[PDB]
Paper text:
Polycomb repressive complex 2 ([name]) trimethylates histone H3 on K27 (H3K27me3) leading to gene silencing that is essential for embryonic development and maintenance of cell identity. The interaction of [name] with substrate nucleosomes involves mainly two structural elements within the catalytic subunit EZH2, the bridge helix and the CXC domain. A central mechanism of [name] activation is the recognition of [name]-trimethylated lysine peptides by its EED subunit, resulting in conformational changes within [name] that lead to the allosteric activation of the complex. We discovered that H3K4me3-containing and [name]-containing nucleosomes inhibit [name] using two distinct mechanisms because of the differences in their positions along the histone H3 tail.
In the first state, the H3 tail can be seen binding to EZH2 and entering the EZH2 active site (referred to as ‘tail-engaged’), while, in the second state, density for the H3 tail appears absent (referred to as ‘tail-disengaged’). In the tail-disengaged state, no density is seen extending from the histone core and interacting with the structural elements that channel it to the active site. In the tail-disengaged state, R504 satisfies the DNA contact made by R497 in the tail-engaged state, while R497 now makes an additional DNA contact upstream. Importantly, this alternative binding geometry in the presence of [name] reveals a unique interaction mode of [name] with chromatin that is incompatible with catalytic activity and highlights the sensitivity of the H3 tail-binding pocket within EZH2 to the surrounding chromatin environment.
Residue numbers in the entry:
A (entry chain M): 36 to 122
B (entry chain S): 34 to 122
C (entry chain K), D (entry chain R): 12 to 119
E (entry chain Q): 24 to 102
F (entry chain J): 25 to 102
G (entry chain O): 41 to 135
H (entry chain I): 46 to 135
The structure:
Amino acid sequence: IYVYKVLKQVHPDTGISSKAMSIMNSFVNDVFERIAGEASRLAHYNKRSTITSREIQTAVRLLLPGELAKHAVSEGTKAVTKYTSAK
Amino acid sequence: YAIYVYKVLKQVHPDTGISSKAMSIMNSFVNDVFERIAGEASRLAHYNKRSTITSREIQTAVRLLLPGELAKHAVSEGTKAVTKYTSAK
Amino acid sequence: AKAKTRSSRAGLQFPVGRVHRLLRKGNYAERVGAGAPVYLAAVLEYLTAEILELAGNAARDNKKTRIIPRHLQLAVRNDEELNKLLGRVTIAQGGVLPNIQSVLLPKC
Amino acid sequence: AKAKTRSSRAGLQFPVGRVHRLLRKGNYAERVGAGAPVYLAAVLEYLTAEILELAGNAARDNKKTRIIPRHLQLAVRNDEELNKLLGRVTIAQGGVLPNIQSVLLPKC
Amino acid sequence: DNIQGITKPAIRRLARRGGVKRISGLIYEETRGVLKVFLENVIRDAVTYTEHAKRKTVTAMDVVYALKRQGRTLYGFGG
Amino acid sequence: NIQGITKPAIRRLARRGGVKRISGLIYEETRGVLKVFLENVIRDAVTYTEHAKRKTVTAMDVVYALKRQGRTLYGFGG
Amino acid sequence: YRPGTVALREIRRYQKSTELLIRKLPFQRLVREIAQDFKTDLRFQSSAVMALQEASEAYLVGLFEDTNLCAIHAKRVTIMPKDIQLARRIRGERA
Amino acid sequence: VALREIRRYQKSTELLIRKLPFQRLVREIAQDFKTDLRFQSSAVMALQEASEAYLVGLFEDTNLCAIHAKRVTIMPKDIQLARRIRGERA
DNA sequence: CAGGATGTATATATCTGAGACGTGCCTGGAGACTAGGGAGTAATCCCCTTGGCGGTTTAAACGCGGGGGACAGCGCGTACGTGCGTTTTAGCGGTGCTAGAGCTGTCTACGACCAATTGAGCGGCCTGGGCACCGGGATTCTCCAGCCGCCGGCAGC
DNA sequence: GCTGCCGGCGGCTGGAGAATCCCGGTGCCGAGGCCGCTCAATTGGTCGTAGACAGCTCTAGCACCGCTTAAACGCACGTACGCGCTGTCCCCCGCGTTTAAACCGCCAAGGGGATTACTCCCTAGTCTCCAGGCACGTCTCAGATATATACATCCTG
């Protein structure tokens, strides 16, 4: 559902196939693991016990190369402030 | 892991020592290997939808990473060690 | 009453609660904060939106309505920043980028 | 009653308790068994013993009484299987195996 | 006597996809050799995964899992 | 500071590599590769140090950075 | 046609397509034969068969463009085995 | 004498680049990411020797490629080819 | 050095029909609504180790200059990979067919969790003496360039 | 024919710079005893994952033949390989020298790290109802064929 809505929000007149969506699902799952394990290792590196936005931000800067990283950080910041502004 | 390794030398080479740099290097070695084995074992324990890490997971891990002769020597000593552990409580 | 989902308040199209459950049950850390799943959902939405938009533009350039993995490969391999991220990844029925070394063509 | 270490009962010179503690606060799994720390200690002990014997052989070859990371490099790189196991690992003060390509040598 | 089932035009087609202009005759066996080393490397992990799972059928999950373990992860198979 | 890599330094490095003859154009190419590899480690090194709110680049952070890149280091802790 | 013209035509023809190059049945037989050496009396899923198939295709395609680079560096147009083992050695699998 | 040096450095282990110029280069390249940075000493030699290992591996790969090219001299095209094959430049 | 005939590619008209897209049903998990108690957070102080300074001195880089051989270019022998025709031989498949291995639900039981005591393993901190470091000098160890006896053409007859 | 003659040819001789060994003195610093504390072994109990049994059942390998399409064998041939001659000009390799790293010593202090009172944030516990997965069910516009023209070659004059 969510990938379909993402497609509709950018291309409302473009469809997708079946296997080409399983590819997207595998990609998202792989990136989720690659970021979550990284954030967990940063959390354990400083002898910490909680995972917050700072560790995930550092993992994003580490993983995403350059321009994608700086684009991601801004959107994540606005996304976290709209959450904190109105719970 | 300094003292255990020193006992290892004294049980292998009673007349050979070890430098401090070698000590730190092989300490990092054992830490790296432990982390690799534990990570693979935890990965398998989650991968087969279980919640307890047992000797079977460690056995699969050692059979999985160490290539060749090390694999069967390691599994042989693992089984013999756990058997003498359980036989003599 | 008046239940409200976290995705709506976060302005996202992603199941933030599902990501929070995955983090809790994934054995990454003993305790998990609050904004980490929101940030993860946001970055995932960004990257998947960029990927899907590139694939859609490639499909439109190929004069085809739906999206196939061939267009996925053409869109992924044509962006070096994306290429480095997906350098060690192969896609089912993706094909290769059509290229020829300049030497083996005839003289003129 | 009189207490005794787990390693003595297990006939090992590696710390069963320390390995168990590392597994427990290692975040790896919620619960662990009893034979897993013993197995891990045994395999670590075997690997350390074999690597230290391989270093000691070279140390006595070079007529020295203590191990130098250079000897560790020789022991690791002179065993092809161990080189495969330790291919990407770089050793401090290890140098490189001596090697000269055949053509670079003179005619006779 | 089955590895020879990888016919010569198949290798020629594969190399033309690679983009070669001329093809020798001595590469047809070295390509087969690298092929079998690839496959036995993958299927040893694939079989040991099932053995740990103590089943008798090898699914796509085990093979893709082992492929990703070597650092050659592949999408499109329910990863 | 890039020129601090003197010509005999790369010469002896290549001799350790196992080369016999050296032309006159490897020198700046080597310096560029050296600089690129340096920045590729300083980036995540300063990232790690900034994450910990510290101002000193400890050896632990750089060995972690080398491990992340895929080339582990032995001797400096672990 | 002049020699190599058909080669160019096939190069431009086949790099655009994406379908497989090896017949399914021989590859299945090869995989089954190899699987006997590790554990006999097994059962295979077709999904795994095509996964192995496409992985093999990707690696061989990789090795072929590396061989092409070796051949062009060798001031040649043909491809020779020294190139294929050079490409295997530089990458480091056979190190 | 070139082969004599080949015999000479292949047995030793110490670093082959002066410490202070390397430290100056590291500080010069690190000032751009952040200003007023302090470097621990051991990290400097760790980075130095890691770079030495990387570079000597690159040299050995390039020499192997050059001897494959039926030549005794190494040229930048060999280095670019080796980088392309190893999968680093592209 | 400019045209012609050609096997190629390109476009374009119906077929034509498995399955993205709704459309509902139903269910289980995520939000709404209660403390708590322990993980982090400033605030503090107390080391510490690091950037910095300024004489020697001392091994190392560098521009110069001479030299010799590795390499790119060009030419020629030559042999084997390619374009193409003729079998022929194996893959696709479509049809059933069979039991085997995979999946899930229930009942039980035993082993990891955790709390409270009690004892020793070892990390630290001196400490004496033990094994590498360095110097010179004698001992070999190869590397080179010329002398020389021998040899196979080379002008004559 | 047969005299010299001439240049190489390798075989040998010996001088040449290089690498190695051990003695002899001098340190620097892994290895060992001590103290105590801090965490690890022992008891004692629980309650819930994990193993068994017991079913259901979806599914993968067999076989079977009709068709056919790509694979194997052969065959002129010309192009791309491999080798040999060659003309340098571009690195190597000592030398004077000019220079910058390394030691060596003494400081200040901004930053790293251990303690401490606390507070307030995610976890622990239930209820509830609504978003999402599954079973269909279509009618599509998504494909697929088969048709018809331009094109870039290799020959000709």
